[PDB]
Amino acid sequence: QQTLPVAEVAQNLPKKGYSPFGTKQSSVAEWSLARLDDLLNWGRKGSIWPLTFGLACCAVEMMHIAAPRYDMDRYGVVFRASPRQADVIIVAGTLTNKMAPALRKVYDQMPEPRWVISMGSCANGGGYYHYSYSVVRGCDRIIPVDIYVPGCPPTAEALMYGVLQLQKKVKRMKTLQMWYRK
């Protein structure tokens, strides 16, 4: 476990930079590829489009986030209905066996780079129905989950905090910079 620095330590330290990669690149190609990754991540970070799967009980919070108290399009997030145009999927609610193939199908019909947020306990690990004959214990067993938002349901603040955490993950992803090594 680590802890935040103290006031004087902050005073010594410089600006934390903007691109999470930093600005230590050696050669022209390195420095150039650093910027292009930064632009790409900036695009994919600023504009992110959930699919609004929202099966149950959790869905109500998935709507309150769209509501005008913790506005989410403020951050550049919009609910596109069509999975071909949706970039992110907030799986929320329980995943019953009847639904499992449906979720799988919806997921891979969506084009990548696709990130999944598992909202609520029901999706995270099956939640409160974990020992049930009809529920997928978690949603990790159908799809690759990216961010877990604990809660039952998570308070709207918690959900969109997780969204920002996804934005941070979208910010630090290294595709061009490290293709250069590939």
């Binding site: 071909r84 199908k105 919806v106 019909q109």
Partner: protein, 117 residues
């Protein structure tokens, strides 16, 4: 005109170049059996899904054509009105529109859009 023609060709070429460019800018992914299925809300598409062609939409579009042609007949009234003889232009045009209304109102009493199916 051909000034218009060339501009359209230029735009279309620039348009296809842009979409051609985006086709290379977007990263590729290994194809998937299921990624290329019709979208049916996440449940397997049924048989061919080709819709029945027993319906009315051609009938509405046929009403379109009748009125679309009739529109053609009345387009030139704007210019000829300054030249044509006024009785003939007056009466001739008036009966066009009058017949249209009567066709319409007679047809409401018919009520053909309120089909049983």
């Amino acid at each position: 005109m051909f000034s218009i023609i060339f501009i359209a060709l230029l735009i279309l070429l620039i348009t296809t170049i842009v979409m051609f460019l985006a086709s290379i800018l977007s990263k590729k992914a290994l194809i998937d059996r299921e990624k290329s299925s019709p979208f049916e809300c996440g449940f397997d598409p049924k048989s061919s899904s080709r819709l029945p062609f027993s319906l009315r939409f051609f009938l509405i579009t046929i009403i379109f054509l009748i009125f679309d042609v009739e529109i053609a007949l009345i387009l030139p009234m704007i210019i000829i009105m300054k030249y044509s003889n006024i009785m003939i232009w007056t009466i001739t045009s008036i009966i066009f529109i009058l017949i249209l209304l009567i066709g319409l109102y007679h047809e409401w009493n018919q009520g053909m859009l309120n089909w049983s199916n």
